[PDB]
Design a protein around this ligand. Structure first.
Ligand SMILES: *[C@@H]1O[C@H](CO)[C@@H](O)[C@H](O)[C@H]1NC(C)=O
Ligand SMILES: *[C@@H]1O[C@H](CO)[C@@H](O)[C@H](O)[C@H]1NC(C)=O
Lengths: 51, 50, 51, 50, 51
């Protein structure tokens, strides 16, 4: 890795949705299903094409 | 900026230019610049390599 | 060639590779971030690590 | 939570249990679990050696 | 990397300094000054390789 620029979700400044989405994303990270989602959408399609 | 969509979930890097104007959540996945390079070719194929 | 170059390489190079083997015992910190993450991980390559 | 500290600059892992209580800034470093094993040295078994 | 936990500074709920401290952290990351201090002491002495 050279840089470090994580992604995110857009939200207007005067909107309380940012904190709730933060909580939900942290919940997903703790549950670990973000890892399996990334594996499905990155490795799962590429699994038959493994080296 | 104009409230046509109030949640723009997409691949959208967290940046100083954006963060002043738009408000972001935590990084749901972190990445960075990485170097892609083709694997080194070798003279492995060929039954007559001996 | 092996004696001249001597390219040392660890037996384990990834999480699943360490999971498959049983000679090298794993490690963690009791009531720490790593141990708590491994608990309730429900991930295929980490459930056996927790076991 | 008691406002006794205005900031908590420290290696605080961003977690759901903490986020419901306090407010975190965006991470300055992204870390995670990693394997620490000793550097391999010159060694070999008996039969697999040859 | 196994997990993707993130660090960050702590602020009370609704504190107005979070929205500016995150701006400061992002500016530091963009200018690369967070990487210099990340390499300030982690490379304490370097890896001695002779072979
Ligand atoms: C190895 O060299 C060949 C010929 O120069 C070229 O196609 C490429 O750089 C490598 N080929 C493969 C299949 O990796
Ligand atoms: C070489 O590695 C072995 C691993 O079993 C270790 O026991 C030994 O102390 C090492 N010798 C060194 C680092 O000189």
């Amino acid at each position: 890795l050279i840089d470090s620029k994580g992604y995110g979700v857009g939200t207007p400044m005067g909107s309380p949705y940012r904190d709730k989405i933060t909580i939900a994303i942290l919940q997903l990270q703790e549950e670990g299903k973000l890892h399996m989602m990334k594996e499905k959408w990155w490795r799962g399609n590429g699994c038959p094409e493994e080296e | 900026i104009d409230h046509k969509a109030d949640l723009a979930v997409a691949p959208l890097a967290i940046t100083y230019v954006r963060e002043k104007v738009i408000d972001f959540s935590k990084p749901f996945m972190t990445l960075g610049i990485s170097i892609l390079y083709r694997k080194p070719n070798g003279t492995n194929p060929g039954v007559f390599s001996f | 060639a092996f004696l001249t170059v001597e390219r040392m390489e660890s037996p384990i190079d990834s999480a699943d590779d360490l999971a498959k083997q049983t000679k090298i015992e794993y490690g963690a910190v009791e009531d720490g971030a790593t141990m708590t993450f491994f608990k309730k991980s429900k991930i295929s390559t980490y459930d056996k690590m927790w076991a």
